[PDB]
């Protein structure tokens, strides 16, 4: 089957700027490469087909070219609706096959996370479980590491980390980290800490609670 290698996987840019994506096929596809845009809430949009032909409804600031194995998409003078996921697809032969995608995200200034920690709720403790939650909110860029400690010992098992897609309004990311314990384990320990390390500082942002306080 034709394998297509799409690169880069991630791009950051601002409105009015230009980006380029490459797609390389494992064997010749003649000129027959198409490009699509995917956005949550919308249906996928065909941008270009046959390497360089604009699909109706695609603005002239989209340019594609190539033949054989190596193709390129360039989007110039970017507009807000262009910040989205892009895929290429060969349409020379069956099976029809896709690149793995490029996420074009909106550039903004770096921002440290706002970190909040929450003990297990009385409600959850009553039901017999215990989860400790840390929100790392409104930061940029996306990469961040969270470390949990219980009574000063790092804990890795039982941790669920979930990132939002880039915020529609302020262009940040947020991540929720949930440490799921058991009721008995929670009751055996007093100190719970979550530590966020982000490029905005060499020092982690630390939030903690101690059951001996409240």
């Amino acid at each position: 089957d034709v394998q297509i290698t799409q690169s880069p996987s991630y791009l950051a840019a601002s409105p009015g700027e230009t980006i380029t994506i490459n797609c390389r096929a494992s064997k010749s596809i003649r000129k027959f490469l198409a490009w699509y845009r995917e956005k949550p809430g919308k249906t996928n949009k065909l941008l270009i087909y046959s390497g360089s032909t604009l699909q109706s409804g695609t603005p002239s600031r989209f340019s594609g070219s190539g033949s054989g194995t190596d193709f390129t998409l360039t989007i110039s003078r970017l507009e807000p609706e262009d910040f989205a996921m892009y895929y290429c697809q060969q349409h020379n032969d069956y099976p029809l096959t896709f690149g793995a995608g490029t996420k074009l995200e909106l550039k903004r200034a770096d921002a440290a996370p706002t970190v909040s920690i929450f003990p297990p709720s009385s409600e959850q403790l009553t039901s017999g479980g215990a989860s400790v939650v840390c929100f790392l909110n409104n930061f940029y860029p996306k990469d961040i590491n969270v470390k949990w400690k219980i009574d000063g010992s790092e804990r890795q098992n039982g941790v669920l980390n979930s990132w939002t897609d880039q915020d529609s309004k302020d262009s940040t990311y947020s991540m929720s980290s949930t440490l799921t314990l058991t009721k008995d384990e929670y009751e055996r320990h007093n100190s719970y800490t979550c530590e966020a390390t982000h490029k905005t500082s060499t020092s982690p942002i630390v939030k903690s609670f101690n059951r001996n306080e409240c």
């Binding site: 699509y36 065909l46 032909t53 349409h91």
Partner: peptide, 12 residues
């Protein structure tokens, strides 16, 4: 798309 029969102009 009506021309390139192996492309996807419309999706659900």
């Amino acid at each position: 798309n009506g021309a390139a029969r192996a492309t996807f102009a419309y999706w659900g």
